Design a protein around this ligand. Sequence first.
Ligand SMILES: Nc1ncnc2c1ncn2[C@@H]1O[C@H](COP(=O)(O)OP(=O)(O)OP(=O)(O)O)[C@@H](O)[C@H]1O
Lengths: 194, 195
Amino acid sequence: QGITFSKNDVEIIARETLYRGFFSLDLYRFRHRLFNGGMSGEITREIFERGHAAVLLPFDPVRDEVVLVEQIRIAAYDTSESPWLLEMVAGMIEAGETVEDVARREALEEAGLEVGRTKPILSYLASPGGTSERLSILVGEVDASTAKGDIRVHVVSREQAYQWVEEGKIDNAASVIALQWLQLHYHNLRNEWT
Amino acid sequence: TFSKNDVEIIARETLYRGFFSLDLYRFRHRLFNGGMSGEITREIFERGHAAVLLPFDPVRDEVVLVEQIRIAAYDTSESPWLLEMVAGMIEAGETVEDVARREALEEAGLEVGRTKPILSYLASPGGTSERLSILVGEVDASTAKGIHEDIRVHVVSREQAYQWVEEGKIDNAASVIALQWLQLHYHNLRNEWTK
Ligand SMILES: Nc1ncnc2c1ncn2[C@@H]1O[C@H](COP(=O)(O)OP(=O)(O)OP(=O)(O)O)[C@@H](O)[C@H]1O
């Protein structure tokens, strides 16, 4: 079956910016259809607005290796042993840029990686109870033996990277989603990129 | 190679206090080439942390999803009504399991049997501290009833739920992560819970 209602079954009455700095905190005021058939009353929700991002999983299909980038993310501090995380290449998307354009650029800049073919993985909402942020992931064909370049660049086997997901050593959403997808799809990907 | 001793959090300055909070972290950290950074500031969205339950019936190979509006999805989605995992915020002194069991009962009338941790992830750690801890919980999908803020309960085959991830019809991080895990692990999990 699936979801019942569409973007046309909600009325956004007004938006209000409660905080504006590098990012924003907005208040949405809205009403929406109910499953029974009625119309909700007026609801307000706080929403963290920080734009949207492109993510690239660098995968070498011949070596069966991924490239990860390590750097500090201070928001991890309170719930992690260390705030230095192993992550995918990623960048914010500015007006007029494509996901692929940003993903290729950041792969070159962050990890010194020239990307061959790309393929979409998935596009996901990071945490839609409280933020609008959407991240669109591509897998990018790389030669992992060329990975060069603060930030530290790591080359590891696909199996090792996935075991690190299982063990909680990689535990940021973008990387977890990308590496789980790779564990499910690497056979067909290796075939396609031969 | 760095630990928390390699960070100095100078201050956390309140930027906004409402239902959620926004703080300015002011900090210095050690550099890979040696030495410390200067003062760095980052805006961090603080909303607590969450417990997430993937309700899985191993006898029937079915999963239970809950549907409701998430207005933050509006600007980038076909619809702001999302198909999701049971979830709730963890309050002081609560365990992940306490919250998962409570929300499973309240939102979907489900009693939970055995549980296994799937994984615990940071939603978007460049800008928010939020951590979400996912459990898979054994349920009898023939007890999945809608109760009676506005939620609809869906019972679907695991294969359909995973096909919806592939198609983008399920596209929130918690549900994508849980259902990808299930697609990787269901054969062993069904054996473990039907032995
Ligand atoms: N939470 C935040 N609060 C304030 N500014 C931010 C935040 N996140 C990112 N920025 C700004 O966005 C720029 C690019 O963001 P990005 O996620 O690439 O950070 P980064 O990897 O720490 O970057 P940098 O190489 O500048 O250290 C950062 O240099 C910083 O100026």
